[PDB]
Amino acid sequence: LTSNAVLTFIYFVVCIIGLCGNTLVIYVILRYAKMKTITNIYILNLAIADELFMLGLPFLAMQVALVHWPFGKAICRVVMTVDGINQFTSIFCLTVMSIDRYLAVVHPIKSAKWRRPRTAKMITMAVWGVSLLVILPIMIYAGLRSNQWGRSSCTINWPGESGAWYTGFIIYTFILGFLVPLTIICLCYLFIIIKVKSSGIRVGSSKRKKSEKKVTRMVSIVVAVFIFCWLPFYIFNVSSVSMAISPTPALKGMFDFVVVLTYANSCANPILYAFLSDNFKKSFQNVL
């Protein structure tokens, strides 16, 4: 088969570029000039999440390469658990950054009292804890599953013959990891845009077009990247729960690319949050 050769390469290059970007980012923030702002703490936690998520990625590249999973059962549970713990903390840290930006922009006076490094550290600990808590069903019911031909699959071994468990888990993860975070992000960014426009009009400042255009482009790029990276996984999983699909090599490549997209969003994250920030670029230029 050619699909394994053309897809394991995709998985490995995605892992490599994500790892290199995240390690360069964390190097620049770590004890060089940063550790002075809340946004730096958030970017550091997001970089930890993305890096661990990328280390978790290459294990299932061999599963998609050769169909069976030769890593045993304990490594299966470890890689699933790490995956849940990384994916959900990444999404939730994105949401927390959006909330912090909202509080800093639309409420610069009242929210400035509650924006302290201690609060930031507490929120990062809490988000890591809630990511650890939310991934419990995978932590419990994951494992291997053999078949007639003598292969396996590092999947979730649900109890019982009733397919309602698949429906429940897919709806639960869909809601709690797509709908609430996206709604929070969209509301915060829309309110930020309205506040920027209102404050620009209120004083009568110039360069209104440039600032509004840049903020709108930032919001559009972030939300579009998130949707394009995260949504097809959820359509395909929901369709698989609802209907009955027959396996074809075209659908094989479709599923593999749909899965890889999630990691791609995790890698695109440092570029959009540090490598393009105007405050990080001065330290990057100091480095190079």
């Binding site: 699959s153 590092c154 071994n157 109890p159 698949y166 897919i170 396996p247 599923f255």
Partner: peptide, 14 residues
């Protein structure tokens, strides 16, 4: 234990 084909980040089989 359901004869699933496409679930969470993995292609199982049957």
């Amino acid at each position: 234990a359901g004869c699933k084909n496409f679930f969470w980040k993995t292609f199982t089989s049957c």
